[PDB]
Amino acid sequence: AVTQSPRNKVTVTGGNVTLSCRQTNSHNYMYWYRQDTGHGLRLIHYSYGAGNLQIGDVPDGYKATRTTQEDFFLLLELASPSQTSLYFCASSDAPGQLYFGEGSKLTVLEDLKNVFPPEVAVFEPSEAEISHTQKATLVCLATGFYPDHVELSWWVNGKEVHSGVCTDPQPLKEQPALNDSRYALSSRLRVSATFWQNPRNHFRCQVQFYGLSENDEWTQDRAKPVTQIVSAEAWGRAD
């Protein structure tokens, strides 16, 4: 029962970021790790109890504080792009046996003007698939977004669904040659043909984007690309 906060965060270089972790289940050992592709998990700092701090393998640029037995904080006092990562808190009650929180995804950006929310569109099942397979696949496309920090979900009749869903594990770069490319992401929701052909059924692809915060500075003429949800919907259709 390890709880970490915020689950998602975006900041500019030089920003101040604190990650919080609390554990209710009465453990002594607590840990902060980052996970990066090519590196697995690397330990940043850890602690055996209130007031104890021990440096891990990759402490540079991080400080930590263990103020109570329940609470373990990770501080990025001057955030740098290299600290873009997925961060995990863990606690333990037995040597090497660790219980993990759900992760805090952080992006550190150098230039807030590279930031763009996704556009989202839903594409309706083809009638050829409907006839051939008795099934109907809707596609959702989220495109043109930066940074690569979105969560896509499907909602049918106002309820989140997971069955019949597959969303690409990683967004692709719209300009794969560029380090700073915007991204796009696809997902499918497959339902029986009869479910799609009922016009009383409502479908919505929802993309939560993490971008600028209310406290972020912005003076440009496009809308501030804030953290926001962009969605597209379709009702079922009999044809």
Binding site: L141, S163, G164, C166, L172, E174, Q175, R188, R190, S192
Partner: peptide, 26 residues
């Protein structure tokens, strides 16, 4: 550059006990 193609993705239509692969291009 201008043509986008995803990797294959396995979906599972549970009530149908039916899984299927797909990729999207646009």
């Amino acid at each position: 550059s201008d043509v986008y193609i995803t990797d294959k993705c396995v979906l599972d239509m549970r009530s149908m006990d039916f899984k299927s692969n797909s990729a999207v291009a646009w």
